[PDB]
Amino acid sequence: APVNISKAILLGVILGGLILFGVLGNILVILSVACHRHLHSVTHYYIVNLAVADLLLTSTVLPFSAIFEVLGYWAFGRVFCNIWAAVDVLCCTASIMGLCIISIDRYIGVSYPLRYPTIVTQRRGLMALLCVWALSLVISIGPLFGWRQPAPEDETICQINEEPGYVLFSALGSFYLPLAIILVMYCRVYVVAKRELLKFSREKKAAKTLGIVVGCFVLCWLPFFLVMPIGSFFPDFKPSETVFKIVFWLGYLNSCINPIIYPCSSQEFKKAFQNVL
Ligand SMILES: COc1cc2nc(N3CCN(C(=O)[C@@H]4COc5ccccc5O4)CC3)nc(N)c2cc1OC
């Protein structure tokens, strides 16, 4: 259907700029971790895992959301709508468990600096990464593909499951449980760092950087997981759908915010970014 030109063009341009910045940042993070040989570690492997997750979030789901916004309605196939929702959930739920294992690794490193290489070894790190990716896949496409509501008869409609039975499970298994794990691990990290040398300081600095990243992610994605379950469990059903869109976009903004954090909070990452550009 016809829509605005100037406003739509401006909105599309700004959104495209956002995706371009996010993709550039994630690619920069991946290249900085990979090409450099002094940035190899299980923590940096988890960092590139998060970079891949939010790069997928910025490269496929984000452009589709931007195009939907510009058009005002769904234009692609219904199968494409389902795959779009599934990829959105998969990326936003794999990032959270990536942060969970990053928090576990940072707790191990802060608590046991000297013995850190003997606990979180390369093999164990990759095993944990693969387990996280598999569990994120399962949690993402279980409630959706498994318990799927009757399909709408309109090809132009691409909505979100509003049934409480799905929103409760998705919020619990995607945000609230991994979030609780992350808070437990970082409260432990904070207490251990404060109560507690050349390697301990490095672990503390990495923990601070990844804690900033985790805080940004949680702040960005909290409004959505607070408004969706509330909307389903209360007479108010996502009031001001505009605000519902704003909370999704704020959540997506973390995908672009994250690459800024690594240089601005880790001088090693700043040097790597400077010398890779
Ligand atoms: C991990 O976080 C999750 C993300 C999810 N994402 C989707 N999407 C994203 C895109 N999308 C929209 O409807 C959005 C929002 O609503 C709209 C309303 C009117 C106009 C446009 C709108 O754009 C369709 C599919 N679906 C789910 N079930 C999700 C579940 C999750 O777990 C709790």
Numbering used by the authors: 19 to 214, 261 to 341
From the paper:
Among them, the α1-adrenoceptor (α1AR) comprises 3 subtypes: α1AAR, α1BAR, and α1DAR, which mediate signal transduction via the activation of Gq/11 proteins. Antagonists targeting α1AR have been primarily utilized clinically for management of hypertension and benign prostatic hyperplasia (BPH). The complex structures indicate that both doxazosin and silodosin bind to the orthosteric binding site of α1AAR.
Doxazosin is a selective α1AR antagonist that belongs to the quinazoline class of drugs. The structure of the doxazosin–α1AAR complex reveals that doxazosin adopts an inverted L-shaped conformation within the binding pocket of α1AAR, establishing extensive interactions with surrounding residues. Specifically, the dimethoxyquinazoline moiety of doxazosin inserts into the orthosteric site of α1AAR, forming hydrophobic contacts with multiple residues, including C1103.36, V1073.33, T1113.37, F2886.51, F2896.52, I1785.52, M2926.55, and Y1845.38. In addition to hydrophobic interactions, 3 key hydrogen bonds are observed: the oxygen atom of the dimethoxy group forms a hydrogen bond with S1885.42; the nitrogen atom in the pyrimidine ring forms a hydrogen bond with D1063.32; and the nitrogen atom in the amine group forms a hydrogen bond with Y1845.38. The other 2 moieties of doxazosin, the 1,4-benzodioxane-2-carbonyl and piperazine groups, are accommodated by α1AAR residues D1063.32, W1023.28, A1033.29, C17645.50, Q17745.51, F3127.39, K3097.36, F3087.35, Y3167.43, and F862.64, which are primarily located in TM2, TM3, and TM7. Consequently, doxazosin fails to establish the π–π interactions with F2896.52, which are observed for silodosin and tamsulosin. In addition, van der Waals interactions involving residue E872.65 were observed only for silodosin and tamsulosin but absent in doxazosin-bound complex. Conversely, the inhibitory activity of doxazosin was not diminished by these substitutions, highlighting the crucial role of M2926.55 in determining ligand selectivity.
